Amino acid sequence: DPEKVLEQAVIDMQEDLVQLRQAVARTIAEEKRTEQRLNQDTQEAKKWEDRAKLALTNGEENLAREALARKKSLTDTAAAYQTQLAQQRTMSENLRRNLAALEAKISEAKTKKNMLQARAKAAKANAELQQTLGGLGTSSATSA
Amino acid sequence: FERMENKVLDMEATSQAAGELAGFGIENQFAQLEASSGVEDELAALKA
């Protein structure tokens, strides 16, 4: 039955769109966690810059250049986490747009099929009434 | 700090997981609330 087949296809699509919601929720957690990483790495870069300011106040250029090398490493690491974040942001929006498109397509497909099924049932019922009404009475009158 | 930063990463993942689904009509409802608040300020100007 095509009605049962299309209902089952729409049910399978509910499982797929729930997996796509899980992929969005995963990607949302990845973007938030990599933001948190680069945010704390840039705060540690400020601490190492302040360690260099203390070293320069004490005249220890050796410690100041080492502390600035820690700052450089941390800001380069935060730029790596910002580059990975850009991949998570575009993936997050791609999965979100794919979910909105999938939900719209399912809703339209189901409602168009439902109205077509109702019209097809009326069309066969009208044709059946033409076949029953079209034959009767004529053979009854001839038999009388 | 290791346990705490793992909870910060859990809060980033939780903030993504809430934010990624939560695109809603409610932003346009807040615009209607600001319009209704504007009508209450016009009624206060009328009272004045």
SS3 of B25, please? Answer: coil
Q: Are A77 and A41 in contact (CB under 8 A)?
A: yes
Give B44's DSSP letter. Answer: H
Resolution to one decimal, Å: 7.0
Select the residue from A28, A35, A44, A84 to test the B interface by mutation, using most B Cβ atoms within 10 A. A28
A90 touches chain B (CB under 8 A): no
Give the nearest partner residue to A32 out of B5, B16, B23, using CB atoms: B16
Query: What determination technique applies here?
Result: cryo-EM
Residue of A nearest to B12 (CA): A32
Q: In chain B, which residues have their Cβ closer than 8 Å to the Cβ of A91?
A: none
